Design a protein around this ligand. Structure first.
Ligand SMILES: [Zn+2]
Ligand SMILES: [Zn+2]
Ligand SMILES: [Zn+2]
Lengths: 1177, 145, 93
């Protein structure tokens, strides 16, 4: 087996977000880090939308990310810390739209190691030094400089190592043009390792250390070191120099502290708490992230707690000492991984899970009566505030994110013919079930139907500079209904078209001239309503026409084209010559004339005999051929279009051809998109040109950032279309369906996928599909959680212990506490407990999202398994089995037992009826229907259960699986069992002796997350660490036998993906395509693994990958082969994400690589597109 | 990388040479194994190289300097070609052997495997159980979603 | 032989080779596939030592490289690879 790796939807989770002037202008951008992807975003201040400018794969692990600039510069640089032993400095080039690598310095070995730096990045605020640090013992400092050409300069590093020391966070200190300083949170562990009593581990303190870099003497001095009262997470740089003092804020548990070296005393402020908090009273509070904003007059900090509450922080000063810290509740947002405050008053929030948000800061300097808290207030007890809806922020934009994907299913549950992706996403009270379709989300704006079978429709303006449309010529086969535009749709009469005849052409030729064409001749009507009735002699019927702004060329029966032309005056000029050809035409058209020059000269004509031919219209070479090309079948429509000029041939079978247009048609690309004829129509997109292919499916060709796309419509069948410009839709498509007349719109240009979301209560773990009704059965579970009954009773109990305060009782806060409830999707779920759980079973319709049934389990019960099945001892009834753990502790692990619930699943799969509850001695973690019975993994044991009258009855058991059963898979009488730490184990069921027998296992340990059966002898698996593998039994394997087993399975495929996969499925994604192996990650990514067809295909892609590994090496200093061999060496997988970076290289490198491969760059690009469209889109 | 089609043809000669009384035979054969394993890396000859590792390993108990230096280089090349997992599986036998000589040799081999690919070993360590006083199980890796 | 490696943190200076040992790997003495450029530390590139051969110390006329095998095994990620003579002094051989 030989496979090829292709990403369909890149990851959407965010790890780091920085902001600066990266293009060099006055705009501000945001550089975000996905896991192994670097991205550049630009939010528009006038619309509040965020756009993606650039996305690059770095083939590594980004661990830290900082920005800086030098004194006097107007452009910001990027420093990256990664899992290469290197530090890289990047610069954005707007004219090329790429990241250029400026510098790269090597200091150690690869991998996320413990004593090699790369985890922490600190930069001097004036931009003349950068520190990079490991979690243990090793720190390096580089000095940044400039030459007379204003080019960056990096020096040899200086060491700041310290043995037996742990680092928590490193930050650069803002001194103003003095020597640079860095501040770290440290912890020496040398004495806790020598004390058997364990009380050197206790009362070991965290210190704050200041490192000073002497620029004139070129060495590092440890300047100050002070122990702290309690342990802290991250530090914050306070703006110094002339705009403030120069210290740090230490964020700890329950406190925030200000410190500085010298005569400055420490100032502490406790973190305020929510009043009437339903959380667990034993938990503390920390800050999770922060953001600084510095105006010319003042500065403030924004800081967020574990519950999502943002606090505004300010400092009261004297000449140079800080005296007070003030805190004040700002707003509540979802918990963020990072947040940026932009100039122009916008707050970007990158959430740690789910969708991202852009807010507009409406209020700063507060005109409200909420209380402020301060470190100077005497307190014996803590502060208390009341959360409330958004007051200072206004939501403006929202970025979709699939992270984290916990379970996926590819099926066609809606009765379309393409499959859909049913994805269980999200975390906690922000979880949801999302349906993904391939195509473009259309925005339906108007729908109306009139009797008739409209075979054609146009959309005309009445003079050239109109910004909206004028008429809607909906013409049937024998009649024509001309309508108008008034936002009040009318049937216009004075149009002058007078269509008693069916209309086949309508366009805007002159200054204000309309031209209607019909099989009975041509009718030119300008602002003067008088008929210039042109007719074709005899009885010969015009078949089709072609129009433009300056020329109206026709052809009647026999192929006698009649070239016209519009003089600058406004009347036609019949040409002297009239051309013929061998056979009549089945299509013809001509290019649009620009407003610069006079008119067109190219004119394409297609024939029924499987040939299309180009005819010139040069006044010096009128009606003389230039190019003739044949087709596998006859076409139906052409479209000579821009967006380098192109030409779109639409064959009348289910294939679309696109070629480059020139007197020599060289390129041509195919996409068979079918089951119906292909009609082509020209429309507008993003102010640019676009084409609209139409078949059983309706597609749309368009360019976006100099990049062609061919994406279908997530819609039903159309028949005809056009552009549309009105106050209703300035950018619309007046589509006509069978027995209807619709008006649509589309405003999404990228977006390979298109989604709809259905909210959920807890985190989803698994779902199954009911075969009869196609309903979903979902189990949702959360650790650290309350059930609804527990919450209600806790609220009641708190209310009465409030109402017993014995103090004038006349003013009761209890009645207001009991009635108001904060929505948990906004304010968060009350995380309270350690061994506390909360589960739910949900039956859901997948078409709409309505819940049909809901079961709520008791408090400390956690559902981990679900199956829907039939039992052979009963009839054709269905059953739902859920496995639950009872009182589970995660660290250290311990349970009290388990249960398996059985429900009856009645009313066409709409209702669960409880049947019984069977106790087991461990977590039932897997459930698989197996030959009229069920297989259940109970901790370490594999069992067969049958359905009894009062419980499930055990029939057979095997007790030789190693640790813990996470999955069970079945085919025939074969059982594949996944272990938590070992790989797959193979088991056979002997019916006649009632035995479960192990007959094979693996030679490697694998932390298995998911598994999928490929055939009777082959399993694909995924790991906790980011690898995919394929394991196959040798052909000599004896199924009937009696370190673990003698027979061993062979590994035939190994690949490091970079993200943790939790879903694998073998399926076909497009109609008329081949089978792929689809996977989804925890970061929101969707990728495929596809086979090669011949040896010659596999040798070509191998050479491409081998040459790009050396000429286009990864951006952060990683080795590609080394990154794909992270835990095991790569085996039999080509990386098409690297292979497809060929299309982003510079023409010099493209030329060199194509010379090496003995081809042309257009030929290399076409082979890449061919394998992609064969399996995926 | 052209030598990936010719490992099976040469393995019998190397099997004879790695079991031989002459020390120079074994030294040169280990050099061959090292260059083969580093030359084919990322092409899938793990079966052939595992077979050869079985014949390289018995020579780690060698008192001669140049021979033991050739054997260590062959082992470091086979680390790259085969994976740190198989090397750790071979090495876990004698880290706590009663014999101090076995312990010396095995800790040398383990220290090589540890300095090269320290981060890949997080996935390959075996499960060690809690005793009375100390906790040795890693529970996060036992979490199930 | 009283010869060790320097093994200090290497900086931005580039190692040189004399014309005798010109195309060799500074680590394994091989001639096959020079891959990665050699960096030396700031002390080993100073004053009269500027531009001398990494291997022997003679006048340098070309750049020093790591071979492909050493790059694959990540032997370029240790310290400065200059050869130090412990049996003699600074201005000695
Ligand atoms: Zn070498
Ligand atoms: Zn040195
Ligand atoms: Zn020399």
């Amino acid at each position: 087996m030989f496979l090829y790796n292709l990403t369909l939807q890149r990851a959407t989770g965010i790890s780091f977000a920085i902001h600066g002037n990266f293009s060099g202008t006055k705009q501000q951008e945001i550089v975000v880090s996905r896991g192994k992807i670097l991205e550049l975003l630009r939010p528009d201040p006038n619309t509040g939308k965020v756009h993606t400018l650039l996305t690059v794969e770095v083939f590594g692990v980004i661990r830290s990310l900082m920005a800086f600039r030098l004194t006097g510069g107007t452009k910001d640089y990027i420093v990256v810390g990664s899992d290469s032993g290197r530090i890289v400095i990047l610069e954005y080039q707007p004219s090329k739209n790429m990241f250029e690598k400026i510098h790269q310095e090597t200091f150690g070995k690869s991998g996320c190691r413990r004593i090699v730096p790369g985890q922490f990045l600190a930069v001097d605020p004036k931009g003349r030094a950068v520190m990079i640090s490991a979690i243990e013992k090793q720190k390096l400092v580089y000095i940044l400089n400039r030459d007379a050409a204003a080019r960056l300069t990096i020096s040899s590093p200086l060491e700041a190592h310290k043995a037996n020391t742990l680092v928590y966070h490193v930050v650069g200190v803002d001194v103003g043009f003095e020597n640079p300083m860095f501040a770290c949170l440290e912890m020496d562990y040398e004495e806790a390792d020598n004390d058997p009593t364990g009380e050197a581990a206790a009362n070991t303190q965290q210190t704050l250390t200041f490192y000073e870099l002497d620029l004139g003497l070129n060495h590092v001095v440890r300047k100050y070191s002070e122990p702290l009262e309690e342990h802290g997470n991250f530090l914050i740089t306070v703006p110094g120099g002339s705009d403030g003092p120069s210290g740090v804020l230490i964020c700890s548990e329950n406190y925030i502290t200000y410190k500085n070296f010298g005569d400055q005393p420490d100032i502490r402020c406790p973190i305020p708490r929510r009043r009437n908090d339903l959380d667990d009273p034993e938990r503390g509070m920390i800050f999770v992230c922060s953001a600084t904003h510095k105006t010319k007059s003042m500065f403030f900090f924004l800081a967020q707690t574990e519950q999502g509450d943002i606090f505004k922080i300010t400092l009261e000063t004297d000449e140079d000492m800080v005296t007070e810290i003030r805190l004040k509740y700002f707003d509540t947002v979802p918990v963020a991984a990072a947040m940026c405050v932009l100039k122009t008053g916008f707050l970007f929030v990158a959430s740690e899970f789910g969708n991202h948000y852009l807010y507009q800061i409406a209020h700063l300097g507060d005109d409200d009566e909420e209380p402020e808290f301060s470190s100077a207030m005497p307190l014996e007890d803590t502060f208390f505030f009341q959360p409330r809806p958004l007051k200072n922020l206004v939501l403006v934009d929202e970025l979709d994110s699939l992270s984290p994907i916990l379970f996926c299913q590819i099926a066609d549950l809606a009765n379309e013919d393409t499959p859909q992706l049913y994805v269980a996403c999200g975390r906690g009270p922000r979880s949801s079930l999302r349906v993904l379709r391939h195509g473009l989300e259309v925005s339906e704006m108007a729908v109306s139907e009139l009797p008739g079978n409209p075979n054609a429709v146009w959309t005309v303006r009445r003079h050239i500079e109109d910004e909206f449309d004028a008429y809607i010529i909906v013409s049937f086969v024998n009649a024509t209904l001309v309508l108008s535009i008034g936002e009040t749709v009318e049937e216009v009469t004075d149009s002058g078209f007078l269509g008693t005849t069916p209309t086949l052409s309508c366009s805007l030729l002159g200054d204000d001239a309309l031209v209607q064409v019909y099989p009975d001749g041509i009718r030119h009507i300008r602002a003067d309503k008088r008929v210039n009735e042109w007719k074709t002699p005899g009885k010969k019927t015009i078949v089709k026409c072609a129009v433009n702004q300056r020329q109206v060329v026709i052809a009647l029966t026999g192929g006698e084209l009649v070239y016209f032309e519009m003089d600058p005056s406004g009347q036609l000029n019949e040409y002297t010559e009239r051309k013929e050809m061998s056979a009549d035409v089945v299509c013809m058209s001509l290019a649009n004339v620009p407003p610069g020059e006079q008119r067109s000269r190219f004119l394409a004509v297609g024939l029924v005999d499987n040939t299309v031919r180009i005819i010139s219209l040069d006044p010096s070479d009128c009606l003389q051929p230039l190019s003739m090309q044949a087709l596998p079948a006859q076409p139906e429509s052409l479209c000579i279009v821009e967006m380098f000029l192109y030409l779109n041939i639409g064959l009348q079978n289910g294939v679309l051809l696109r070629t480059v247009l020139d007197p020599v048609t060289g390129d041509l690309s195919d996409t068979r998109t079918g089951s119906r004829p292909v009609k082509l129509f020209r429309v507008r997109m993003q102010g640019q040109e676009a084409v609209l292919a139409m078949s059983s499916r309706s597609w749309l060709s368009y360019s976006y950032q100099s990049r062609f796309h061919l994406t279908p419509l997530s819609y039903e069948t159309l028949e005809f279309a056009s552009g549309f410009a009105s106050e209703q839709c300035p950018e619309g498509i007046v589509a006509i369906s069978t027995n209807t007349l619709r008006i649509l719109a589309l405003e999404k240009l990228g977006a390979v996928f298109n989604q709809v979301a259905f909210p959920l209560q807890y985190t989803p773990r698994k779902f199954v599909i009911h075969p009869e009704s196609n309903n979903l059965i979902i189990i949702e579970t959360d650790h650290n959680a309350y059930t609804e009954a527990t919450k209600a009773q806790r609220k009641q109990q708190m209310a009465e212990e409030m109402v017993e305060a014995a103090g004038e009782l006349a003013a009761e806060m209890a009645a207001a506490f009991l009635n108001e409830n904060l929505p948990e999707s906004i304010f968060g779920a009350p995380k309270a407990g350690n061994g506390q759980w909360a589960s739910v079973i949900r039956v859901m319709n997948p078409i709409q999202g309505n819940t049909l049934d809901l079961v709520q389990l008791e408090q400390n019960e956690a559902a981990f398994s679900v199956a829907v099945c039939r039992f052979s001892n009963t009839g054709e009834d269905w059953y739902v089995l859920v496995g639950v753990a009872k009182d589970l502790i995660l660290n250290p692990r311990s349970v009290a037992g388990g249960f398996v619930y059985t429900y009856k699943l009645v009313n066409n799969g709409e209702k669960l009826e409880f049947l019984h509850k069977t106790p087991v001695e461990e977590v039932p973690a897997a459930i698989a229907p197996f030959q009229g019975r069920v297989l259940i993994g109970v901790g370490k044991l594999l069992r067969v259960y049958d359905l009894g009258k009062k419980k499930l009855l055990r029939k057979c058991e095997n007790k030789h699986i190693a640790n813990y059963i996470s999955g069970i898979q079945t085919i025939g009488h074969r059982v594949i069992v996944s272990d938590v730490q070992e790989s797959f184990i193979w088991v056979r069921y002997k019916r006649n002796e009632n035995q479960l027998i192990i007959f094979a296992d693996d030679t490697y340990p694998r932390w298995v997350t998911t598994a999928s059966l490929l055939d009777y002898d082959t399993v694909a698996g995924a790991d906790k660490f980011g690898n995919i593998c394929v394991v196959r039994l040798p052909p000599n394997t004896n199924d009937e036998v009696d370190n673990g087993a003698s027979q061993k399975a062979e590994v035939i495929m190994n690949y490091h993906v970079g993200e943790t996969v939790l879903s694998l499925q073998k399926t076909t994604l497009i109609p008329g395509g081949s089978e792929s192996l689809v996977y989804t990650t925890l970061s929101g990514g969707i990728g495929i693994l596809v086979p090669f067809t011949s040896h010659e295909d596999h040798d070509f892609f191998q050479h491409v990958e081998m040459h790009l590994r050396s000429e286009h090496p990864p951006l952060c200093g990683r080795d590609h082969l080394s990154f794909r061999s992270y835990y095991f060496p790569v085996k039999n997988v080509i990386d098409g994400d690297l292979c497809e970076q060929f299309n982003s290289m510079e023409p010099n490198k493209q030329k060199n690589v194509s010379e090496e491969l003995d081809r042309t760059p257009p030929e290399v690009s076409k082979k890449l597109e061919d394998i992609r469209t064969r399996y995926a889109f | 990388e052209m030598g990936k089609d010719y490992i099976y043809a040469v393995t019998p000669l190397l099997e004879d040479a790695l079991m031989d009384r002459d020390l120079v035979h074994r030294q040169t054969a280990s050099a061959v194994v090292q260059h083969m394993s580093l030359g084919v890396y990322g092409f899938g000859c793990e079966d052939s190289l595992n077979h050869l590792l079985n014949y390289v390993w018995p020579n780690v108990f060698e008192t001669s300097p140049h021979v033991i230096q050739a054997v260590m280089g062959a082992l470091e090349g086979l680390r790259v070609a085969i994976g740190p997992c198989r090397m750790l599986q071979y090495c876990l036998q004698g880290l706590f052997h009663p014999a101090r000589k076995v312990r010396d040799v095995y800790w040398k081999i383990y220290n090589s495997i540890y300095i090269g690919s320290q981060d890949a070993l997080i996935a390959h360590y075996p499960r060690i159980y809690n005793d009375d006083k100390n906790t040795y199980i890693r529970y996060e890796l036992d979490y199930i979603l | 032989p009283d010869l060790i490696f320097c093994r200090k943190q290497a900086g931005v200076a580039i190692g040189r080779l004399c014309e005798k040992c010109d195309g060799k790997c500074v680590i394994c003495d091989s001639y096959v596939r020079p891959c990665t450029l050699v960096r030396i530390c700031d002390e080993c590139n100073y004053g009269s030592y500027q531009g001398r051969c990494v291997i022997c110390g003679g006048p340098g006329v070309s750049d020093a490289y790591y071979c492909k095998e050493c790059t694959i095994q990540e032997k370029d990620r240790d310290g400065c690879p200059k050869i130090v003579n412990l049996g003699s002094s600074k201005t000695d051989l």
